[PDB]
Write a structure and sequence with these properties.
Elements (H helix, E strand, L loop, with lengths): L1 H11 L9 H9 L7 H14 L17 H14 L11 H12 L1
Helix pairs in contact: 3-4
The structure holds a DNA/RNA duplex.
Family: In the C-terminal section; belongs to the helicase family. RecG subfamily. In the N-terminal section; belongs to the UvrB family.
Organism: Escherichia coli
Function: Couples transcription and DNA repair by recognizing RNA polymerase (RNAP) stalled at DNA lesions. Mediates ATP-dependent release of RNAP and its truncated transcript from the DNA, and recruitment of nucleotide excision repair machinery to the damaged site.
Amino acid sequence: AELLDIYAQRAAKEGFAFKHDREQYQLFCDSFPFETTPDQAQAINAVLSDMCQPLAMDRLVCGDVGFGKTEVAMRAAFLAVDNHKQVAVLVPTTLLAQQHYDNFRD
RNA sequence: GGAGAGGUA
DNA sequence: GGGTATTCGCCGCGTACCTCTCCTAGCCCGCAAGTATCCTATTCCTTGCAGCGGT
């Protein structure tokens, strides 16, 4: 019952349509000391395109370990926080909390 | 279908 | 040898109809269903020794 009601409530109303800046997000892209591989960049584009829609984004980023999964989330968080939306990160351990704190702060 | 129990003439 | 007696085992004991109950024990194997130890959050407090005002 609880899960059915949550799904119905989330599928009923329309989520925030993020506003994307091209050149300002380009600086954040320039801050990355690597080149996004064509698949990581494609996941990034899908994520940003979905965030920039009225519909609520529900997505999975299932890729193999160590393939830059974190950076896609960092770009999505930058897009969200550019619009002052208080990104919330949830990791299932303290070491992940500390490591992601360090990486995001950097 | 077969066993066992009871019953009628 | 043999005529006799004695024992032993087999075969047999009516028709027709009506009501009811009950037809293997046990094992095994796989389903599946219900439990003791390991990390990251939480609510639960009770001691030991040095500062420290204050006189």
